[PDB]
Write a protein that binds this ligand. Structure first.
Ligand SMILES: CC(C)(COP(=O)(O)OP(=O)(O)OC[C@H]1O[C@@H](n2cnc3c(N)ncnc32)[C@H](O)[C@@H]1OP(=O)(O)O)[C@@H](O)C(=O)NCCC(=O)NCCS
Length: 182
């Protein structure tokens, strides 16, 4: 997994840390601003890593952009010194126009899966599921109520395997939604 020039276990005492625009250092140290800089560095690097893996020319996730856009990120640390980071999922509500099965446009504002990444060295070990499930439970949203931003084939296979999400409603934007969404 991905390691950092500082102590991740101390920064993130919980296995899954939930952060929003205020980037609050979790309850216990270095000064608060220094801990926030650590968190920024982690999000910046997670976003970079997710970006390469997706053939992205630019990351969709960074510390500054998460703050400005008021997204929420769930970061999973490694349980296997100084700790390391396994991956993350980034979510947010977006106002969308979405097509239904009747090819009719609909104004909706669902919870969106905006970025999702698990370190390559530890994929297909069930970490993505654990993280996704945690997010669902915290957000109080059902999987079929989600919109997915530009999913990979991997993520589509994932959503089928773990949540029986298979049948999609064809869109012209770059979001995917499932039967059940409406
Ligand atoms: C998508 C991702 C978050 C899944 O997390 P994960 O920790 O690998 O997932 P889990 O181990 O909980 O679930 C594994 C399931 O995901 C799917 N999956 C994961 N890696 C896969 C691969 N290389 N090929 C095909 N399916 C894959 C499969 O359904 C797999 O089940 P299987 O092993 O029974 O085939 C992770 O693979 C990833 O980071 N991918 C790279 C970037 C990306 O595409 N994600 C962003 C979506 S746009």
């Amino acid at each position: 997994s991905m390691e950092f020039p500082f102590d991740v276990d101390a920064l993130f005492p919980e296995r899954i840390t939930v952060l929003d625009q205020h980037l609050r250092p979790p309850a216990r140290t270095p000064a608060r601003v220094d801990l926030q800089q650590q968190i920024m560095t982690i999000i910046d690097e997670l976003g970079k890593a997710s970006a390469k893996a997706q053939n992205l020319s630019a990351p969709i996730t960074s510390a500054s952009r998460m703050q400005s856009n008021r997204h929420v990120v769930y970061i999973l640390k490694d349980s296997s010194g100084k700790g390391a980071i396994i991956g993350f999922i980034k979510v947010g509500y977006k106002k969308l126009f979405v097509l239904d099965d009747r090819e009719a446009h609909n104004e909706v504002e669902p919870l969106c899966i905006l970025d999702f990444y698990i370190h390559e060295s530890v994929q297909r070990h069930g970490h993505g599921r654990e993280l996704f499930q945690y997010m669902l439970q915290k957000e109080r949203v059902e999987p079929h109520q989600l919109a997915i931003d530009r999913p990979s084939q991997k993520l589509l296979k994932f959503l089928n395997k773990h949540y029986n999400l298979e049948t999609t409603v064809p869109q012209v934007n770059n979001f995917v939604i499932f039967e059940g969404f409406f």
